[PDB]
Design an enzyme around this catalytic site. Structure first.
Site, short mmCIF file in Angstrom:
data_model
loop_
_atom_site.label_atom_id
_atom_site.label_comp_id
_atom_site.label_asym_id
_atom_site.label_seq_id
_atom_site.Cartn_x
_atom_site.Cartn_y
_atom_site.Cartn_z
N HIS A 131 -8.57 -14.25 0.49
CA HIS A 131 -7.38 -14.41 -0.37
C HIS A 131 -6.65 -15.72 -0.16
N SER B 255 -11.39 -17.53 -2.73
CA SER B 255 -10.72 -16.25 -2.57
C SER B 255 -11.73 -15.13 -2.62
N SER C 85 -5.81 -12.40 -6.18
CA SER C 85 -5.03 -12.58 -4.95
C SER C 85 -4.59 -14.01 -4.67
N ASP D 36 -13.97 -11.96 4.32
CA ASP D 36 -13.04 -10.85 4.12
C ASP D 36 -13.58 -9.98 3.00
N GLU E 156 -12.91 -9.86 8.46
CA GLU E 156 -11.48 -9.55 8.47
C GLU E 156 -11.19 -8.06 8.24
N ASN F 24 -11.38 -7.02 12.37
CA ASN F 24 -10.57 -5.94 11.78
C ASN F 24 -10.07 -5.01 12.89
N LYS G 90 -4.89 -6.56 15.01
CA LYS G 90 -5.12 -6.61 13.57
C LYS G 90 -4.94 -5.23 12.95
N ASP H 196 -1.59 -5.45 10.92
CA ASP H 196 -1.88 -5.89 9.57
C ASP H 196 -2.04 -4.71 8.61
N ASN H 197 -2.98 -3.82 8.90
CA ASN H 197 -3.31 -2.74 7.95
C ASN H 197 -2.10 -1.81 7.81
N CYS I 224 0.84 -3.38 5.00
CA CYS I 224 0.97 -2.55 3.81
C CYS I 224 2.34 -1.92 3.66
N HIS J 249 -9.74 -2.11 -0.32
CA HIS J 249 -10.34 -3.43 -0.63
C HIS J 249 -11.02 -3.62 -2.03
N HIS K 233 0.65 -9.39 2.37
CA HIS K 233 1.39 -9.19 3.59
C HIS K 233 2.22 -10.44 3.90
N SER L 2 -3.46 -11.53 12.49
CA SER L 2 -4.82 -11.40 11.96
C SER L 2 -5.57 -12.72 12.02
N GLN M 177 -8.82 -14.44 13.89
CA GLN M 177 -9.88 -15.18 13.20
C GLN M 177 -10.25 -16.48 13.91
N1 LIG Z 1 -4.49 -4.32 0.71
C1 LIG Z 1 -4.54 -4.84 1.93
O1 LIG Z 1 -3.90 -5.86 2.18
C2 LIG Z 1 -5.42 -4.23 2.98
C3 LIG Z 1 -5.11 -4.40 4.33
C4 LIG Z 1 -5.97 -3.87 5.30
C5 LIG Z 1 -7.13 -3.17 4.92
N2 LIG Z 1 -7.44 -3.01 3.60
C6 LIG Z 1 -8.58 -2.22 3.10
O2 LIG Z 1 -8.02 -0.90 2.91
C7 LIG Z 1 -9.02 0.13 2.98
C8 LIG Z 1 -8.67 1.21 4.01
O3 LIG Z 1 -8.60 0.61 5.32
P1 LIG Z 1 -8.20 1.46 6.62
O4 LIG Z 1 -8.20 0.44 7.72
O5 LIG Z 1 -7.00 2.35 6.39
O6 LIG Z 1 -9.55 2.34 6.80
P2 LIG Z 1 -9.53 3.67 7.71
O7 LIG Z 1 -10.99 4.09 7.93
O8 LIG Z 1 -8.62 3.46 8.93
O9 LIG Z 1 -8.84 4.68 6.63
C9 LIG Z 1 -9.52 5.24 5.49
C10 LIG Z 1 -9.09 6.71 5.34
O10 LIG Z 1 -9.43 7.23 4.04
C11 LIG Z 1 -9.86 8.59 4.21
N3 LIG Z 1 -10.69 9.01 3.04
C12 LIG Z 1 -11.97 8.67 2.79
N4 LIG Z 1 -12.38 9.22 1.62
C13 LIG Z 1 -11.34 9.93 1.12
C14 LIG Z 1 -11.10 10.78 -0.07
N5 LIG Z 1 -12.07 10.96 -0.98
N6 LIG Z 1 -9.87 11.31 -0.24
C15 LIG Z 1 -8.88 11.13 0.67
N7 LIG Z 1 -9.05 10.39 1.80
C16 LIG Z 1 -10.22 9.77 2.06
C17 LIG Z 1 -10.59 8.60 5.55
O11 LIG Z 1 -10.71 9.91 6.12
C18 LIG Z 1 -9.74 7.63 6.37
O12 LIG Z 1 -8.77 8.35 7.12
C19 LIG Z 1 -10.29 -0.64 3.28
O13 LIG Z 1 -10.91 -0.89 2.01
C20 LIG Z 1 -9.81 -1.94 3.93
O14 LIG Z 1 -10.78 -2.99 3.86
C21 LIG Z 1 -6.60 -3.52 2.64
N1 LIG Z 2 -0.92 -12.66 2.43
C1 LIG Z 2 -2.19 -12.46 2.74
N2 LIG Z 2 -3.05 -13.51 2.87
C2 LIG Z 2 -4.35 -13.30 3.18
N3 LIG Z 2 -4.85 -12.07 3.36
C3 LIG Z 2 -4.09 -10.96 3.26
C4 LIG Z 2 -2.68 -11.09 2.92
N4 LIG Z 2 -2.18 -9.84 2.85
C5 LIG Z 2 -3.17 -8.98 3.15
N5 LIG Z 2 -4.31 -9.66 3.38
C6 LIG Z 2 -5.65 -9.13 3.76
O1 LIG Z 2 -6.34 -8.52 2.68
C7 LIG Z 2 -7.43 -7.87 3.35
C8 LIG Z 2 -8.16 -6.91 2.42
O2 LIG Z 2 -9.17 -7.70 1.78
C9 LIG Z 2 -6.81 -7.18 4.54
O3 LIG Z 2 -7.78 -7.00 5.59
C10 LIG Z 2 -5.62 -8.08 4.88
O4 LIG Z 2 -5.77 -8.71 6.17
NA NA Z 3 3.16 -13.12 1.44
#
Ligand SMILES: NC(=O)c1ccc[n+]([C@@H]2O[C@H](COP(=O)([O-])OP(=O)(O)OC[C@H]3O[C@@H](n4cnc5c(N)ncnc54)[C@H](O)[C@@H]3O)[C@@H](O)[C@H]2O)c1
Ligand SMILES: Nc1ncnc2c1ncn2[C@@H]1O[C@H](CO)[C@@H](O)[C@H]1O
Ligand code: NA
Ligand SMILES: NC(=O)c1ccc[n+]([C@@H]2O[C@H](COP(=O)([O-])OP(=O)(O)OC[C@H]3O[C@@H](n4cnc5c(N)ncnc54)[C@H](O)[C@@H]3O)[C@@H](O)[C@H]2O)c1
Ligand SMILES: NC(=O)c1ccc[n+]([C@@H]2O[C@H](COP(=O)([O-])OP(=O)(O)OC[C@H]3O[C@@H](n4cnc5c(N)ncnc54)[C@H](O)[C@@H]3O)[C@@H](O)[C@H]2O)c1
Ligand SMILES: NC(=O)c1ccc[n+]([C@@H]2O[C@H](COP(=O)([O-])OP(=O)(O)OC[C@H]3O[C@@H](n4cnc5c(N)ncnc54)[C@H](O)[C@@H]3O)[C@@H](O)[C@H]2O)c1
Ligand SMILES: Nc1ncnc2c1ncn2[C@@H]1O[C@H](CO)[C@@H](O)[C@H]1O
Ligand SMILES: Nc1ncnc2c1ncn2[C@@H]1O[C@H](CO)[C@@H](O)[C@H]1O
Ligand SMILES: Nc1ncnc2c1ncn2[C@@H]1O[C@H](CO)[C@@H](O)[C@H]1O
Ligand code: NA
Ligand code: NA
Ligand code: NA
Lengths: 432, 432, 435, 435
Positions: free
Chosen positions: A53, A76, A81, A131, A156, A181, A186, A190-191, A195, A301, A353, A361, A365
């Site tokens: 991103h 990206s 993003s 990532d 990541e 990750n 991290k 981060d997660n 969020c 993701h 974030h 995070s 890296q």
């Molecule tokens: N948006 C962001 O900035 C951001 C940040 C970090 C991670 N991520 C991504 O977010 C996603 C989740 O990451 P995480 O670290 O929480 O993974 P995790 O394994 O810690 O959590 C996933 C959860 O989803 C549950 N699950 C699976 N299938 C399901 C269903 N059908 N119904 C309900 N629950 C279900 C699992 O039991 C588990 O508890 C991944 O795709 C990761 O790459 C995104």
């Molecule tokens: N501001 C940001 N810049 C870059 N990556 C980010 C940001 N916010 C969330 N992410 C990342 O997006 C990833 C999901 O692809 C997460 O693992 C998280 O680290």
């Molecule tokens: Na930001």
């Protein structure tokens, strides 16, 4: 053909640079790493291709790698993003970046391809910083000739790690990989806290909905789901959680959340958030059961959590765009509001974030890139994690900015609990 | 010279109209008032001049008044609060609106003046709907010839009410006024829950700062301060409160907040929020004592809470604009980040309160306009509040959207507590 | 012909030393009352006053009693609830020579007798000349059953929402024959005691009675006035998920905005692990509700009287199945599913734990002393009507509690004060301000 | 030559009926244990086992004891803390014919004697063949003082972070001469019992001991592991403002992200109304800390041993000033400012209230039974090392508690399960997952 960079609008650079400077102050980890390792230029000769991103936060990572002596190319890992002012600032600094907000899939793939070769003389990459595994997939599946000279991968996110572990099982992982990750600093920050900061932010920017009085459903209660539920509750929404894992479900219950099956939960939802990393969480049966003007989005993701293909095929003719990344569908006389076409909502509808947590995070890296660049020969083609001492160092680097002061163990105390004064403080199975 | 409307960009109307429709669904109070009173056109012959932040929410109020039969003219009561797509949608509907984001003071005053006369034939206003007293001041101080035909004033906010009570004391209040700030369903909801929703929102949009790990100071612990502290705490900031009122201070302490004098509190602040309705809350001594890149903003009605005149005179030569409404000053080698030039931050850097809570405030407004339009002769030139039965009605109108279901008293229960089944349920001194 | 004089009646006077130690600790948590002792004590402004109190005989109340004595009053006392007395507090007060008639676990006859003894002071039977009441039962006894004594009584001070309602009915009916100061509606009482006090003591009392895990449970709170707000907050802070019931659309909308689901009791009660009544009304929980409940639901009341729950119905219909686990925790078998009742449906915070902590009671009781002073000195300037204290005194009470918890106020300049329309030393809000 | 046989030793066996009633209520709050009774009870898989337990003798522990008996075990028992026994629980167990040696308020000699009695079963003195421990004191007695008995003992199960640390030291030193299952580090124990349990019981215990108002106070929690996380949450949920201390930068950063100020004890303690030690380490609060404290500070410990607070220093230096308010609430005058000590610095949740509620203990104790079953049947397949339970069993334990609190799971399709790399019935996370 050599394209030096591709960005939406390079006149956004000045604005981008100002925010990068502000971000630098919020990212003491990365800045401290610049001071510690910058003088020795340990990444001289490295050609790091990143797919991650293209935000203001990422700009600080990029420039950290350059200060350590690396050449860097970048794209990206998501079509929505990129922050165009960040990309512009990076391009204005002479760096080869290929990224803009609102790409299509062909554009997305092209951008990654450009990153594989450096400069007009086309020197290939020798490091991968990924990532989600899309850069990794492009090199291993479509440019396998380049694997010989590449020293390693750092990954990541939870979803990219899962892809690497499948490659490990299948026998197609032909490079060493460091999974950052699952650095504690991290995953548990981060997660979760990331969020927490950015989920509600993104829904507010997109919709300006009142959170108090609403009911929201969060699918999944891993680290992303925990943080997402906390984002919503902190803003005043009442949250219902869905899960498949009995331990994670019992956590949610103990944290005060009702836990139900999606088929039941979705009927009560003003807001729906998918956070699973799995597919088909929200399907046609769910869409038909929803309340009018429900807001549906995804913070996992990939965009398969929500069945957008079904929604577009079946009710696409009714689709109305309110503004970019906020689309309304009429599903049998009740509206469904989709954010960012079901792609990462925090990055797609706001800025992801904040800088402070990304510093952790991205500190992980840089440490992983350093480790593979210097020591790749000591690694098998397998997924590794960083030692706890480095994970603790990353945390230590962020304490002073927020006036966190640690007590120091005496020799007697340290001996008593079986640790050294400067750590590591926990055994490797400790879960925090 | 007759100017039909003045807005930034009328091509934003389609976008504005889409959001107005979404807002309508979030505002059941106003919509219910349209159904109840629309068929009888009780405001036929009324010419309502409004001075009130020209938002999407305000658009719904405007169109509610029109559906009740009123002619309506409009300006904003703040230079940064207009939402240009809202203004454009209103102008596209043929309505005389004079408002855009980023006016200067001359422009601000001009806009209000245009609202006093309706149409090319210049029929003067006969009703005032105000937020902060600036429209009221223009008519009473600069167009007193127009007071004869004006039936009344309705006033939205704590600061405008205070101005009306000073006029009442001084003997210059020459019209009846209804204070809707102190409807229970306004003060205890809009000021409190509204700021809870929009304070953090605005700081995030402006700065993208991580809230967790930060310390924030909120000056004042009335309804705005209560909501502001709650906004910050819900997002993960640690909040220190300042107060002059021992009761309000003891409330803050009981709600879990440290309470200190600003001179002490400001030294520890990552974020500073003024919420007093008073002047000189943040002065030069405070600015010199601040941490680097502190974020300073105001959520009280006027920009005198923060001593911007001092800041601009003394360190204006160092001023750098990051982006609109985010300015950085170098105060003796440490940066101060100012949002919206010290004007209402929620409206200046985001979109103000969400539609759902504004529906309560604006439902009170319509009820007050109805009451003065029909019954102004039964009122003295004094400040009034609405009866509790109407305040309760407003709340009742918002329950169904969020699935709040009331029990109903039996005759026995109602007699026992001395109330009728349909209310009012509390005596007039009840504080909620 | 010859009256019996009982000097005091308490469960066990040997508990006095323990009571005294806790009274001392409470004194440090009650800076308002202690400050009032220092300010007014030397001048003995209540010399000649004979104050009969009817108010939960707790450690906190002991500090109130001794404050009135330090101001020069004679004092007699009973409890306003059968389960609220703390026996070591009562014992300490009795050991100090004070006429107190109170113990935990009275019956109704005993309750009434105790109040009657307080009307006359010493073996020579000097009648009361002041009333300090909590719920109106002392007031009712004097006005309904000893009206000869009203002539020499100067005033009433009333502590609680329910007693105030009774006084306003008397005012309407024309039977209020004394001036009354309503201290329930001091801001520093209603917005603190009822709210933050119940927040502190509701969960406390449920834990002591049942030791139930709060996290994972669903609780229903009936009512969302000040008591209900604090009750919901008690439960949520402990990890319970709370559903609120209400009749008032504004209070309901508050609860919704504070993050709570709001439903009718008929629906809510089916989901409840824990049920709390907080209305001040009657018949909140009836037979239809009891039959709809989950097994081992915990049912209790935090409103002033035991009418909120239909205990008469429960006892008549399923009383034969009743089993006492321990004092004030009773289990009834309602058609094969158990209902756990706390304190027989009487004030649960006081009945199953120790009620509100000393710090918040210091505000309520500071208001009480101020009201007693005001009626004792100035009763002739009052009509037989319900009054509240001026805001300047309400602010003073708050001011006295700031230092203990390190709250420091900014001070307005004359310029700032003029700007917002107030004087520098207050009052800072107009009389309609709701806080 | 001739041994004394004491069948049981408890404070008051007439408290049994009360104990039994609460045990029944607890059984309904413990579906894990009860489900385990139904599943394994009919087959009596622990026939021939003689299980000596050393573990807080609470109502919750009574359910564990009777679960082991229903599985066919003989059981003897003592408490692992001098103040943690609930006397009515102990009485109920004794009344059932079980050899229990436990009461609230033992001294150290009594404590040691009680453990010794558990090693032999019945008048004929059949030695123990299983160890179920909480803190390692039973384990230490057998290995250090009765090593002749190790031959016939099959295994150890250990409940708590501190006992596990002792076992890992034995493992390193080469003195661990039995296999051990560490159930502290079941996910369904550490992430629930230590965290949510302390959240439930920390504040509870401080309220019962002191009745202090939480809102307006500042509390210091030393440590931010699972116990510290739950302790901070207990206090914050009750309205206290919490300052955390730590040595671990990651745990410190967690606390900061969770909204807590984090400072060194030397600084933090000066601001504290309440001090809680939660480290499992020694010398957290020393003489320099005591001299720096505010008047009537409440000081307590929720880590396993009373080393966290320097009670030896406090007693030696200011013991002559000590005044007991009531059992387990002692006041010391440290240079003119009072220090209130709870439970003499021993586990405050168990010492001043009743410890964790039944619902969360059902998870911990379900893990215990599973571990005892596993060692009893399969001890020969284990080395003399510390083990943890497989994730499949950890998930099963959680599953057993969902229905009571109406948690319903979605079920993966085969397609979904393949996609995330798991089977439909789990395990759902890999072994490094931290939850
Ligand atoms: N948006 C962001 O900035 C951001 C940040 C970090 C991670 N991520 C991504 O977010 C996603 C989740 O990451 P995480 O670290 O929480 O993974 P995790 O394994 O810690 O959590 C996933 C959860 O989803 C549950 N699950 C699976 N299938 C399901 C269903 N059908 N119904 C309900 N629950 C279900 C699992 O039991 C588990 O508890 C991944 O795709 C990761 O790459 C995104
Ligand atoms: N501001 C940001 N810049 C870059 N990556 C980010 C940001 N916010 C969330 N992410 C990342 O997006 C990833 C999901 O692809 C997460 O693992 C998280 O680290
Ligand atoms: Na930001
Ligand atoms: N931004 C918005 O959307 C929004 C919404 C509602 C109201 N308002 C405005 O916000 C302001 C506050 O409104 P309110 O309803 O909370 O008023 P209020 O009277 O309820 O609260 C003001 C508080 O500030 C305190 N105060 C005064 N001077 C102070 C000083 N020097 N230092 C510290 N504290 C001080 C007062 O004691 C009082 O408690 C007003 O200007 C009102 O018009 C803005
Ligand atoms: N336990 C304590 O220590 C304590 C402390 C303070 C007050 N009280 C007592 O608690 C009671 C409540 O006091 P309060 O100050 O909150 O009064 P209040 O008037 O502020 O609140 C009562 C609420 O109950 C609601 N209500 C009435 N009937 C109802 C019904 N059938 N279903 C649902 N809601 C209903 C009303 O709408 C109102 O909002 C009084 O009896 C008072 O004397 C007890
Ligand atoms: N009271 C109860 O019911 C209960 C429940 C579970 C565990 N325990 C006991 O509580 C203790 C803590 O258990 P845990 O599971 O949290 O262990 P843990 O390892 O998870 O946490 C201990 C924390 O204290 C920190 N620490 C160590 N020395 C310190 C110092 N001098 N100052 C500040 N911080 C310091 C460590 O960095 C660590 O984060 C153990 O003794 C355990 O047996 C008690
Ligand atoms: N979105 C909005 N539209 C119109 N007015 C608003 C909005 N948000 C807050 N306000 C108002 O701004 C006023 C302060 O001038 C407050 O009294 C509040 O009602
Ligand atoms: N510890 C306590 N001591 C005396 N009165 C109390 C205590 N806790 C609550 N109360 C009072 O109980 C009253 C209800 O009878 C409330 O008005 C409240 O002020
Ligand atoms: N009510 C209870 N009964 C038995 N053990 C408990 C209780 N509460 C806490 N514990 C245990 O105390 C142990 C510390 O000795 C913790 O490991 C915890 O599992
Ligand atoms: Na808005
Ligand atoms: Na108390
Ligand atoms: Na317990």
């Amino acid at each position: 053909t050599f394209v030096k960079h591709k960005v939406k609008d390079i006149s956004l650079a000045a604005w981008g640079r100002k925010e990068i400077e502000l971000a630098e102050a919020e990212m003491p980890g990365l800045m401290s790493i610049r001071k510690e390792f910058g003088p020795s230029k340990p990444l001289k000769g490295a050609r790091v291709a990143g797919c991650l991103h293209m935000t203001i936060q990422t700009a600080v990572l990029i420039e950290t790698l350059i200060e350590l002596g690396a050449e860097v190319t970048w794209s990206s890992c998501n079509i929505f993003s990129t922050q165009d002012h960040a990309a512009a600032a990076i391009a204005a600094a002479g760096i080869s970046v290929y990224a803009w907000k609102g790409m299509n899939e062909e554009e997305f793939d092209w951008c990654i391809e450009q990153t594989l070769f450096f400069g007009e003389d086309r020197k290939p990459l020798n490091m991968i910083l990924d990532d989600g595994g899309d850069l990794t997939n492009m090199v291993l599946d479509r440019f396998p000739e380049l694997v010989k000279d590449i020293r390693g991968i750092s990954e990541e996110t939870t979803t990219g790690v899962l892809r690497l572990k499948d490659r490990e099982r299948n026998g197609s992982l032909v490079l060493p990989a460091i999974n950052i990750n699952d650095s504690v600093t991290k995953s548990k920050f981060d997660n979760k806290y990331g969020c927490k900061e950015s989920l509600v932010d993104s829904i507010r920017r997109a919709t300006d909905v009142m959170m108090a009085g609403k009911v929201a459903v969060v699918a999944g209660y891993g680290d992303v789901g925990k943080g997402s539920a906390a984002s919503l509750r902190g803003a005043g929404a009442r949250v219902i959680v869905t899960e498949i894992d009995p331990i994670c479900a019992l956590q949610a219950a103990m944290d005060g959340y009702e836990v139900k099956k999606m088929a039941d939960a979705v009927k009560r939802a003003d807001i729906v958030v998918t956070a699973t990393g799995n597919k088909n969480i929200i399907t046609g049966e769910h869409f038909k059961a929803m309340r009018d003007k429900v807001i549906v989005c995804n913070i996992g993701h990939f965009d398969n959590e929500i069945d957008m293909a079904w929604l577009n095929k079946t009710y696409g003719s009714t689709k109305v765009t309110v503004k970019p990344q906020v689309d309304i569908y009429n599903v049998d006389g009740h509206d469904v509001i989709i954010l960012a076409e079901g792609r990462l909502v925090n990055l797609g509808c706001a800025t992801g974030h904040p800088s402070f947590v990304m510093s952790s995070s991205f500190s992980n890296q840089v440490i992983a890139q350093l480790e593979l660049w210097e020591n790749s020969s000591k690694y098998e083609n397998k997924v590794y994690t960083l030692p706890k001492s480095l994970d603790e160092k990353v945390a230590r680097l962020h304490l002073s900015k927020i006036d966190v002061e640690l007590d120091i163990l005496s020799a007697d105390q340290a001996a008593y609990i079986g640790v050294t004064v400067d750590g590591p403080y926990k055994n490797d199975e400790y879960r925090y």
